[PDB]
Amino acid sequence: YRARPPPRRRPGPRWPDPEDLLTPRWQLGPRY
Amino acid sequence: ARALDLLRGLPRVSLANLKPNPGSKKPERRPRGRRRGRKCGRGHKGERQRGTRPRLGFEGGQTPFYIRIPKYGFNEGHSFRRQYKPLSLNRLQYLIDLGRVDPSQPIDLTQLVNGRGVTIQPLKRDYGVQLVEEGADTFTAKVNIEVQLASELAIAAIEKNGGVVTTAFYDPRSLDIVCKPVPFFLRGQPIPKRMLPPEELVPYYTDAKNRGYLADPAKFPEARLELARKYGYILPDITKDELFKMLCTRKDPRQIFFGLAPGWVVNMADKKILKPTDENLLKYYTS
Amino acid sequence: PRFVESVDEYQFVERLLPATRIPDPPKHEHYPTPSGWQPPRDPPPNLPYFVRRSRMHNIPVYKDITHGNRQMTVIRKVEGDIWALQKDVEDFLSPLLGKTPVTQVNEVTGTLRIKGYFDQELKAWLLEKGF
Amino acid sequence: IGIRLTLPPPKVVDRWNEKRAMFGVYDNIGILGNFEKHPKELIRGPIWLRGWKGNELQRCIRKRKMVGSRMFADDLHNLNKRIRYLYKHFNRHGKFR
Amino acid sequence: LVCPPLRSRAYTPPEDLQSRLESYVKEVFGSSLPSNWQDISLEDSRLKFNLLAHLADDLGHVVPNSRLHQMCRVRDVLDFYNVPIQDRSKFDELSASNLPPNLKITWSY
Amino acid sequence: EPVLRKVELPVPTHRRPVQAWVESLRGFEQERVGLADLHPDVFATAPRLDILHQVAMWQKNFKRISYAKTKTRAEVRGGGRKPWPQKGTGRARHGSIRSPLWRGGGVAHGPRGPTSYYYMLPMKVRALGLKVALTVKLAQDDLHIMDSLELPTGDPQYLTELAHYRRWGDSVLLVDLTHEEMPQSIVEATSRLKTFNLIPAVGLNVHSMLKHQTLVLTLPTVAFLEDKLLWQDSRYRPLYPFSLPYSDFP
Ligand SMILES: [Mg+2]
Ligand SMILES: [Mg+2]
Ligand SMILES: [Mg+2]
Ligand SMILES: [Mg+2]
Ligand SMILES: [Mg+2]
Ligand SMILES: [Mg+2]
Ligand SMILES: [Mg+2]
Ligand SMILES: [Mg+2]
Numbered sequence: 053y054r055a056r057p058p059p060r061r062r063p064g065p066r067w068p069d070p071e072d073l074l075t076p077r078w079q080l081g082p083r084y
Numbered sequence: 085a086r087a088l089d090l091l092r093g094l095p096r097v098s099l100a101n102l103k104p105n106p107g108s109k110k111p112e113r114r115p116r117g118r119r120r121g122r123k124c125g126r127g128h129k130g131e132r133q134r135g136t137r138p139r140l141g142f143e144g145g146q147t148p149f150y151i152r153i154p155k156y157g158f159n160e161g162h163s164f165r166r167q168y169k170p171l172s173l174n175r176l177q178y179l180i181d182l183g184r185v186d187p188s189q190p191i192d193l194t195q196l197v198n199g200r201g202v203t204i205q206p207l208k209r210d211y212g213v214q215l216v217e218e219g220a221d222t223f224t225a226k227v228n229i230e231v232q233l234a235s236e237l238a239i240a241a242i243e244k245n246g247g248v249v250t251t252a253f254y255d256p257r258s259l260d261i262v263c264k265p266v267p268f269f270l271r272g273q274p275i276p277k278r279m280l281p282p283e284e285l286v287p288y289y290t291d292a293k294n295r296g297y298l299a300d301p302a303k304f305p306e307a308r309l310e311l312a313r314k315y316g317y318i319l320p321d322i323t324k325d326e327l328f329k330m331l332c333t334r335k336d337p338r339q340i341f342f343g344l345a346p347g348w349v350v351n352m353a354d355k356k357i358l359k360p361t362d363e364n365l366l367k368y369y370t371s
Numbered sequence: 372p373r374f375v376e377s378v379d380e381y382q383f384v385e386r387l388l389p390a391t392r393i394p395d396p397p398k399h400e401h402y403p404t405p406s407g408w409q410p411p412r413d414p415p416p417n418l419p420y421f422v423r424r425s426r427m428h429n430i431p432v433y434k435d436i437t438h439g440n441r442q443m444t445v446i447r448k449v450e451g452d453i454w455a456l457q458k459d460v461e462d463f464l465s466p467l468l469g470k471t472p473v474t475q476v477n478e479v480t481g482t483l484r485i486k487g488y489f490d491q492e493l494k495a496w497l498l499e500k501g502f
Numbered sequence: 503i504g505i506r507l508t509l510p511p512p513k514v515v516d517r518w519n520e521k522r523a524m525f526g527v528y529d530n531i532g533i534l535g536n537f538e539k540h541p542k543e544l545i546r547g548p549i550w551l552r553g554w555k556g557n558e559l560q561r562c563i564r565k566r567k568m569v570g571s572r573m574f575a576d577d578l579h580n581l582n583k584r585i586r587y588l589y590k591h592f593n594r595h596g597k598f599r
Numbered sequence: 600l601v602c603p604p605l606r607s608r609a610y611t612p613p614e615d616l617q618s619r620l621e622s623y624v625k626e627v628f629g630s631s632l633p634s635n636w637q638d639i640s641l642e643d644s645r646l647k648f649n650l651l652a653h654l655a656d657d658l659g660h661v662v663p664n665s666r667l668h669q670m671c672r673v674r675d676v677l678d679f680y681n682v683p684i685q686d687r688s689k690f691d692e693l694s695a696s697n698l699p700p701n702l703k704i705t706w707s708y
Numbered sequence: 709e710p711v712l713r714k715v716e717l718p719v720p721t722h723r724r725p726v727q728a729w730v731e732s733l734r735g736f737e738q739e740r741v742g743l744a745d746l747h748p749d750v751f752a753t754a755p756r757l758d759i760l761h762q763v764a765m766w767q768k769n770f771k772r773i774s775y776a777k778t779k780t781r782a783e784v785r786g787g788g789r790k791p792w793p794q795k796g797t798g799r800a801r802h803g804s805i806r807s808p809l810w811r812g813g814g815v816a817h818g819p820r821g822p823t824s825y826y827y828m829l830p831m832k833v834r835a836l837g838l839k840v841a842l843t844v845k846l847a848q849d850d851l852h853i854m855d856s857l858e859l860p861t862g863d864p865q866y867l868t869e870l871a872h873y874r875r876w877g878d879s880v881l882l883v884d885l886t887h888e889e890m891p892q893s894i895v896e897a898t899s900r901l902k903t904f905n906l907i908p909a910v911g912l913n914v915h916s917m918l919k920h921q922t923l924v925l926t927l928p929t930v931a932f933l934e935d936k937l938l939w940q941d942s943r944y945r946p947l948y949p950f951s952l953p954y955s956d957f958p
Pocket of ligand 6 (some may be wrong): 788789
């Protein structure tokens with residue numbers, strides 16, 4: 053069997069949706 | 085080898101041929117049977133098995149030992165007491181012989197902690213490292229060691245061989261970046277300017293005998309002369325050697341690295357170094 | 372806000388950054404090096420065994436305390452015939468104590484376990500032999 | 503009687519399928535994958551435990567602090583009684599004091 | 600495409616094998632300049648490969664992956680081949696042995 | 709022509725390397741084409757079955773997370789009142805229902821929610837577990853090395869007959885460096901079958917190669933894990949996780 057693809061981090065930054073409450077606020081802040 | 089030539093004749097290893105080192109995993113002993121099952125090692129009758137024993141350090145109504153002893157100022161303000169990690173010039177001689185830190189360049193707490201000479205725990209309130217007199221013999225470092233605290237014998241031994249000693253104070257958040265700057269470089273903020281020493285260590289860092297970075301350079305020849313006069317050793321004027329400029333490389337206050345300065349933002353991915361180039365921002369970072 | 376860029380200052384960043392491999396130490400003109408350091412002789416001596424150095428190119432002799440009274444010293448990485456090595460140290464430490472040592476060996480891990488601290492004696496013994 | 507008169511059906515044991523063949527793979531992603539990721543974010547499971555160990559109390563306090571706001575009222579009520587009974591139990595009941 | 604018949608793992612050393620391999624040792628090494636050829640070494644992989652490659656396809660016996668690193672000099676290869684190897688089931692060799700009449704062994708496959 | 713690999717890393721003076729055969733899958737009869745010397749410290753470590761016991765079952769355990777749970781006498785519904793008076797009747801004293809004694813009652817000492825058996829071993833122990841794993845394979849002649857995993861036919865029939873013609877075993881692993889450079893021929897074969905599994909070099913572990921009866925590498929992969937595990941042997945002290953950059957290490 054072909055192995056499942058290797059787990060790799062998200063290429064490029066991770067910009068969550070600001071109008072999305074389950075996303076915590078520290079991502080929206082300038083420090084992130 | 086005698087190990088491998090057995091395995092080629094011996095059968096193949098699998099889960100069935102697998103076993104740990106005997107003596108590592110001792111077998112669990114549960115209270116079921118005749119031996120343990122009766123009382124399970126809890127006693128016959130009393131709080132021991134009922135589970136209502138008193139707390140630890142209880143004397144059955146009698147005053148515990150820990151209350152009958154009076155209070156005294158043993159460890160008060162221990163979260164603000166003065167702490168520094170030792171460092172022996174024996175180790176400095178050892179580490180340069182290993183070649184992890186180069187004496188050709190100026191030695192620093194960064195070059196030290198990059199060499200893993202000694203760990204440092206800035207959140208455990210240790211504002212640097214001190215020199216230790218243990219190791220006066222067998223020392224030919226000739227390095228420009230940067231330190232926070234220093235002993236008299238360590239300074240005399242280093243100056244005898246032609247090295248340079250100097251104290252430089254760091255704040256808590258100014259030190260953790262010093263001992264480990266790269267994660268702050270993953271943040272992108274500007275590196276912060278250092279501060280002056282607190283309201284009690286200023287006489288130390290202003291004195292010339294302990295090589296204070298606030299003290300004048302004019303007084304260091306006097307302190308050098310007295311140490312040579314004290315411990316009876318020639319005073320090698322280090323102006324002769326070609327690398328005299330390297331030995332006198334020192335950082336002014338409110339600057340971390342000899343190259344970098346406060347306000348200078350640094351980047352590694354798509355490597356770039358940036359300035360504010362605003363009059364209000366620039367003139368404060370100098371301050 | 373404004374920002375102006377520079378790249379000439381990048382050399383200071385790499386002098387600041389650490390390494391990830393222990394560098395081979397400098398070839399000092401004078402031996403034995405200060406701090407009691409001495410690299411292993413080259414070529415090694417042909418023997419039934421050999422003792423390698425550690426990550427810091429030190430001797431793999433260590434001490435240990437157990438039960439508050441087990442005051443022993445250990446060696447970690449014996450390679451080859453351990454029975455030849457343990458016989459040598461037994462004859463070496465015999466006249467010091469007046470009795471043959473009753474030490475323990477584990478040829479699986481290639482380790483030794485000797486009662487009493489003799490690290491300074493074993494270090495000089497392994498250095499003069501060239502391990 | 504507890505035993506069964508007739509035997510059970512012989513359960514076929516497929517020792518070669520997708521899971522067992524690809525079992526144990528990508529556990530050493532850090533050791534020989536230039537440390538781009540840790541093996542702890544690999545495991546699929548609850549959010550109150552992803553690469554972390556804890557006893558009955560430790561897992562409960564981590565639960566209510568993390569996901570307790572999303573838990574049900576009844577499950578949250580049973581959780582508070584659980585840690586309260588287990589807090590006093592480990593502290594007051596048992597040997598070694 | 601096509602699978603020829605499998606080669607039997609069993610192998611016995613034919614006579615004058617020393618002369619056969621020695622003739623090839625002189626073919627690899629113009630000529631064998633130094634005497635006492637048994638102590639000749641195989642530090643180079645090309646010499647070891649051309650040596651072991653000709654031995655296998657010519658005789659029909661391959662050195663395992665666990666032993667070629669031990670075959671440092673040529674006399675070790677001589678000792679590895681002059682000893683024989685066999686391949687038959689335990690039932691076959693026990694039946695081949697001179698068992699007495701009272702003893703019998705079966706094979707329920 | 710032959711394909712030789714000479715080790716790029718340094719070797720100890722008192723331990724010589726170990727040679728190993730090299731194969732391919734272009735042809736069927738093609739065997740013993742190329743050699744490759746190998747570092748002894750990683751390919752000649754001691755047996756250390758205790759090391760294999762810990763690290764192999766470690767990856768059996770830390771990934772496990774339970775889900776069993778039993779409701780306690782507080783969690784089972786009801787059992788708030790007292791059913792009958794303390795001295796009123798002959799029946800035994802019972803404070804409520806749903807105790808561990810009553811039918812359908814809660815368990816006193818049972819499984820408690822999803823537990824976590826997660827524990828991380830030292831990186832040196834796990835690395836050394838990988839060092840010794842392929843070592844015993846070399847002693848038992850279980851592994852194999854080849855140039856690349858290309859074959860013209862590309863079907864399970866040719867792959868199966870090629871295996872037990874060279875007498876590898878029943879279960880085999882296939883290793884490659886990255887996830888992208890596998891040929892479409894070999895991967896379509898392994899996808900149809902199950903035994904001759906395929907994995908990349910990053911997913912290499914001891915349990916799979918110890919479960920499977922043999923092992924297969926490629927020369928780029930051999931140099932890959934060698935560079936990693938020898939770097940673990942000559943490793944520097946970790947002050948911080950290796951995810952962050954370094955001077956020489958990427
Ligand atoms: Mg009593
Ligand atoms: Mg009783
Ligand atoms: Mg009570
Ligand atoms: Mg210990
Ligand atoms: Mg209730
Ligand atoms: Mg009630
Ligand atoms: Mg009650
Ligand atoms: Mg129930």
